[PDB]
Amino acid sequence: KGPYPYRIGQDYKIDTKHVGRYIALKFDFSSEGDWYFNGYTIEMAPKAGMR
Amino acid sequence: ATINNVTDLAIAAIQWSDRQDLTQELLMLFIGNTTDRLNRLLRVRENEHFETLMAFGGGIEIPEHFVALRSITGDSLIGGRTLQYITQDIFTHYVNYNYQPQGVTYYTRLGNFWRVFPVVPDGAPFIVNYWTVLPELSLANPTTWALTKYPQIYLYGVLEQIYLYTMDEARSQFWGQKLERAVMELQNEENAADFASTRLAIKDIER
Amino acid sequence: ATINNVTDLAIAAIQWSDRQDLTQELLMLFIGNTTDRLNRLLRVRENEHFETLMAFGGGIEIPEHFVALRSITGDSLIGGRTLQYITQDIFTHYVNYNYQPQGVTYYTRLGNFWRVFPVVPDGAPFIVNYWTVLPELSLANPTTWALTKYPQIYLYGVLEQIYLYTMDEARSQFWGQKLERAVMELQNEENAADFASTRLAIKDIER
Amino acid sequence: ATINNVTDLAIAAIQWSDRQDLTQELLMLFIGNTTDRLNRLLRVRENEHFETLMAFGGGIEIPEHFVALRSITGDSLIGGRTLQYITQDIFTHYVNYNYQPQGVTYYTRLGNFWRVFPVVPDGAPFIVNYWTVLPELSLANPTTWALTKYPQIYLYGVLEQIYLYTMDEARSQFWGQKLERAVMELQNEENAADFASTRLAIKDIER
Amino acid sequence: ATINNVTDLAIAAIQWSDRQDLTQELLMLFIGNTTDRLNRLLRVRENEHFETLMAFGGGIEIPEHFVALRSITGDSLIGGRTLQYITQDIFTHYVNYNYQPQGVTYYTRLGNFWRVFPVVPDGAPFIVNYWTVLPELSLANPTTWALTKYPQIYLYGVLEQIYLYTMDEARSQFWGQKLERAVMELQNEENAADFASTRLAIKDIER
């Protein structure tokens, strides 16, 4: 799915909707900044069937 | 307004359900199922149709799109009367005893035909007012009156069909309830279109 | 539209069920089971049939496709009266006392035959209006009016049969409920097709 | 169609239950149990039978496959009347008081015989209309009318018997309910074959 | 006040829902959906509209914005009478028997037209008072009376649509209940506007 921008220190989360069986996440950091990354959290709605 | 034609409906359904793996044929099948279900429930003004039908062989052929009958009226040349329904036994008695009224007055249903008692030669015009089926929604027919009148009905029906397809229970029931509520609201709006007409067409012929 | 012939129905059933172990024979068996179940419930306009039957040996043979009788009418040569049903005792009394009415008036059921009281010579035509069984849906007969009128019925029936075959029960009940709802909707529409005729054909000879 | 004879029924039962270890004897026993259960519940047109019986020794012997009686009618040469049922006390009173009516009018049941009051010499013909038992399904009798009329009944009965044999209870009662529903549907269809005959054949000798 | 135009409504909905993935198209879709839902429920003073319609071919064409009829009154030149509704049978009887009253008195509905009995030549003016649909809220029409009268209705409807879009159901029910309560409050306030008028417009033509 399309890239979701996230501003470090201001934004609390990113909102999306992605139904699937196996999930995959990718984080892309540009430069001109220093960042520490120590985990995350996934918030999911109730399941959407078995197909 | 809102959803315009079938392509936007399919796009909106895909966006809401997020299932990008659905092909066009599956969406067409879902839309056809929704239309078929609607054909059995809706009797509204946009669904009505009145037209002149000829009489051949002492009978009138039922139109292929017929779903419900409202009225049959003879032409002024043959009496100009609103026909009344009689059973087979009454028809047989009238035929045997040569009732011979002035014009065409009675009708009955035999097979796929409407037989009028005062048998008239071929070529007798009648005015039939009835209800038809909803127009089919597909690529060849991108737009229909139902889609432009209340798009939520089609959106909810397609969503319910999709969730039936993916074998999910709770969401399918939820969207089915939503579709049923939308259909009920649409029917109720037309049922209360004219307050005066509500009293009539209910208490007719008691004896 | 939607589903047009048997092959599309089978493809749609396979797609919805997501089983690839179902052969052609199993699908034919499921379709036959659904048709057999439908044969015991549907009494609609397309199911009707009226035809001229001859009389042999003072009786009329019940057609092999017969499922429910609507009316029997004599030909105008032999009176042209709509027949009435009498029991066996009344038949015996009429025979013994030589009632001798004008034309054929009464009939009763004996075995697989309809016996008329004013015993007529062989070759007396009658007009019988009744209900038949649903046409067989198979490879040799790929299209029927039932499929083209409401494909959801066949789709849900085949899905319920499929889930029965795979030794699953809950989804079988789910699809059975859906199929029953569809059948009830179709029957209700057929019943409400004509408001005027609904009042009649309910109360007959009370005394 | 659907299922044609016993071998296809056994093959379908094996396929549905997946139990390939069942011998042919067990399947024959299951089919026999199903038809024995059916014999106690079905009274349909195909089950009916009327035939001419001789009276010997002042009585009529009940047929061996008799299951339910509908009517007994004397021959026109012996009086041509429809017999009526009386108790033993009324029979004794009629015998003692020398009633002497015109022809054979009454009958009663004694052991395995029907005794008529106006005792007739040996050789009196009667017309008896009654119900028989269903034909046995086996290798010697591959096809019966019941199998060709509604195969679901036999399929569900065999499945229920199989799940009883495998000492499973949930599926056994599920399939038993399914079989009972099928039997009730068939009986209901037969009961509503003709509307007029439903009211009659009920009120006989009230006083 | 509060929310003045569509842009403020969209901003407030985005702020309350806390989502950021909603584009302009989705917000327009949600606003259209809630307006369409409102069109089937609200019958208030601001929704009313009375106008002069001409008569052509012995009938008056129903306006495309029509949703419910209040009254039809003839022009003083043509009689100045408030019309009354009659069924098709009464219309046919009046036509056949040449009732000939003074002015236009009766009307009936045929298809998409109102036919008046004392057939008048084309150009006869009538005054029709009825209800229309709510104005479309969009970028081209940023303000409507409905938004300025009770912004909570639109806010709650958009929130419910948003939560429906994100496949969350409980909050959708929550906001739907809120919206229904707001709509009921508005309708009750409109109904209780005049105490004297409440008693009337309820009991009519009892006989």
Query: Got the DSSP string for D139-183?
Result: SSS---HHHHH-HHHHHHHHHHHHHHHTT-SHHHHHHHHHHHHHH
Q: Is the CB of E167 inside 8 Å of chain A's CB atoms?
A: yes
C-alpha span between D13 and D18 (Å, rounded):
8
C-alpha span between D54 and D63 (Å, rounded):
11
Closest CA to C166 of D173, D17, D159: D17
**Structure's resolution in angstroms:** 2.8
Q: Which stretches within chain D are classed as H helix?
A: 6-17, 24-39, 88-97, 145-149, 151-165, 170-191, 196-199
- Kindly report the nearest CA distance between residue C102 and chain D, in angstroms: 23
C-alpha span between B15 and B10 (Å, rounded):
9
Closest CA to C31 of C142, C180, C118: C142
C-alpha span between E104 and E107 (Å, rounded):
8
Tokens of C148: 């083209």
Q: Which amino acid does the sequence have at B45?
A: R
Q: Which of C82, C188, C193 sits opposite B92 (nearest CB)?
A: C82
Q: Which of D151, D185, D194 sits opposite C85 (nearest CB)?
A: D194
Q: Is the CB of B166 inside 8 Å of chain E's CB atoms?
A: no
- Does residue D36 contact residue D164 with C-beta atoms inside 8 Å? no
Give B-chain residues touching E110 at CB under 8 angstroms: 50, 129
C-alpha span between C132 and C49 (Å, rounded):
7
Chains E and D touch (3+ CB pairs under 8 A): no
Q: Is the CB of C204 inside 8 Å of chain D's CB atoms?
A: yes
- Kindly report the nearest CA distance between residue A36 and chain B, in angstroms: 33
Closest CA to B10 of B1, B23, B196: B23
φ, ψ dihedrals at B186, nearest 5°: -65, -40
A 13-42 residues with CB below 8 A of B?
17-19
Testing the interface with A: which of E14, E19, E20, E164 to mutate, by most A Cβ within 10 A? Answer: E20
Q: Which amino acid does the sequence have at A51?
A: R
C-alpha span between E154 and B29 (Å, rounded):
34
Q: Is the CB of B205 inside 8 Å of chain A's CB atoms?
A: no
Cα first-last separation, chain E: 50
Give A-chain residues touching E21 at CB under 8 angstroms: 15-17
Cα radius of gyration rounded to whole Å, chain C: 22
Q: Which of E37, E67, E96 sits opposite B152 (nearest CB)?
A: E37
Q: How many CB atoms lie within 10 A of CB C101?
A: 12
- Does residue B108 contact residue B115 with C-beta atoms inside 8 Å? yes
Return the C-alpha torsion angle B134, B140, B144, B150, nearest 10.
100
C-alpha span between C151 and C54 (Å, rounded):
38
Q: Is the CB of B109 inside 8 Å of chain C's CB atoms?
A: yes
Strand partners, C128: C51, C72
Q: CB neighbours of E174 closer than 8 A, spacing ≥ 6?
A: none
Tokens of B146: 């139902």
Closest CA to E28 of C142, B95, B3: B3
Q: Is the CB of C33 inside 8 Å of chain D's CB atoms?
A: yes
Q: Which of B33, B40, B92 sits opposite C185 (nearest CB)?
A: B40
Testing the interface with E: which of B188, B200, B202, B204 to mutate, by most E Cβ within 10 A? Answer: B200
Pairing of strands E84-85, E106-110: parallel
- Kindly report the nearest CA distance between residue C63 and chain B, in angstroms: 17
Q: Is C29 exposed, middle or buried (0-12, 13-18, 19+ CB in 10 A)?
A: buried
Q: Which amino acid does the sequence have at C46?
A: E
- Does residue C13 contact residue C7 with C-beta atoms inside 8 Å? no
Q: Is the CB of D197 inside 8 Å of chain C's CB atoms?
A: yes
- Kindly report the nearest CA distance between residue C178 and chain D, in angstroms: 17
Query: Got the DSSP string for chain C?
Result: --S-SHHHHHHHHHHHHT-S---HHHHHHHHHHHHHHHTTT---STTEEEEEE--BTTEEEPPTT--EEEEEEE-GGGT--B-EE--HHHHHHHHHHT---SS--EEEEETTEEEESS---S---EEEEEE-PPPP-SSSS---HHHHH-HHHHHHHHHHHHHHHTT--HHHHHHHHHHHHHHHHHHHHHHTT-HHHHHSSS-----
Q: Which of E69, E110, E165 sits opposite B193 (nearest CB)?
A: E69
Give B-chain residues touching C201 at CB under 8 angstroms: 87
- Does residue B65 contact residue B119 with C-beta atoms inside 8 Å? no
Q: Is the CB of D203 inside 8 Å of chain C's CB atoms?
A: no
C-alpha span between B186 and E36 (Å, rounded):
11
Pairing of strands B84-85, B106-110: parallel
- Does residue B39 contact residue B157 with C-beta atoms inside 8 Å? no
| 3-class DSSP state of E29 | helix
Token match 């009526």: residue?
D84
- Does residue C119 contact residue C98 with C-beta atoms inside 8 Å? no
Q: Which of D73, D189, D193 sits opposite C92 (nearest CB)?
A: D73
Q: Is D51 exposed, middle or buried (0-12, 13-18, 19+ CB in 10 A)?
A: exposed
Query: Got the DSSP string for B74-117?
Result: E-GGGT--B-EE--HHHHHHHHHHT---SS--EEEEETTEEEES
Token match 């506007």: residue?
E193
Testing the interface with D: which of C26, C27, C33, C71 to mutate, by most D Cβ within 10 A? Answer: C33
Closest CA to C133 of C12, C35, C32: C35
Tokens of D13: 């039962």
Tokens of D120: 């007739």
Strand order in the sheet with C106-110: C59-61, C113-116, C106-110, C84-85
Give E-chain residues touching A14 at CB under 8 angstroms: 20
φ, ψ dihedrals at A34, nearest 5°: -115, 130
C-alpha span between B154 and B28 (Å, rounded):
12
Q: CB neighbours of D3 closer than 8 A, spacing ≥ 6?
A: C29, D9, D12, D147, D151, D154, D155
Closest CA to E63 of E118, E148, E147, E133: E133
Q: Do B189 and E67 touch (CB under 8 A)?
A: yes
- Does residue E152 contact residue E14 with C-beta atoms inside 8 Å? no
Tokens of B171: 């969401």
Query: Got the DSSP string for A28-50?
Result: ---SSS-----------PSP---
- Does residue C130 contact residue C64 with C-beta atoms inside 8 Å? no
Q: Which amino acid does the sequence have at B107?
A: Y
φ, ψ dihedrals at D114, nearest 5°: -105, 120
| 3-class DSSP state of B176 | helix
Q: Do B67 and C189 touch (CB under 8 A)?
A: yes
Closest CA to E6 of E33, E27, E34, E36: E27
Method of determination is cryo-EM
Testing the interface with B: which of C153, C195, C203, C205 to mutate, by most B Cβ within 10 A? Answer: C195
- Kindly report the nearest CA distance between residue C144 and chain B, in angstroms: 15
Testing the interface with C: which of D82, D85, D145, D158 to mutate, by most C Cβ within 10 A? Answer: D82
| 3-class DSSP state of B29 | helix
- Does residue D122 contact residue D56 with C-beta atoms inside 8 Å? yes
Closest CA to D182 of D204, D152, D207, D205: D152
Q: Do E36 and B194 touch (CB under 8 A)?
A: no
C-alpha span between B169 and E111 (Å, rounded):
41
| 3-class DSSP state of E7 | helix
Please name the chains neighbouring A, where neighbouring means 3+ C-beta pairs under 8 angstroms: B, E
φ, ψ dihedrals at C14, nearest 5°: -65, -45
- Kindly report the nearest CA distance between residue A4 and chain E, in angstroms: 9
- What region, left, alpha or beta, does residue D166 occupy, with left being phi > 0 and alpha being psi -120 to 50 degrees? alpha
Q: Is the CB of B152 inside 8 Å of chain E's CB atoms?
A: yes
Q: Which of C33, C87, C95 sits opposite D201 (nearest CB)?
A: C87
Q: Which stretches within D87-131 are classed as H helix?
A: 88-97
Q: Is the CB of D77 inside 8 Å of chain C's CB atoms?
A: no
Closest CA to B41 of C185, C95, E71, E103: C185
Q: What angle do CA B64, B69, B73 make, to 5 degrees?
A: 105
Q: Which stretches within D77-118 are classed as H helix?
A: 88-97
- Does residue B71 contact residue E88 with C-beta atoms inside 8 Å? yes
Q: Do B168 and A46 touch (CB under 8 A)?
A: no
Testing the interface with B: which of E69, E106, E115, E163 to mutate, by most B Cβ within 10 A? Answer: E69
Q: Is the CB of D177 inside 8 Å of chain C's CB atoms?
A: no
Chains D and B touch (3+ CB pairs under 8 A): no
C-alpha span between E103 and E75 (Å, rounded):
10
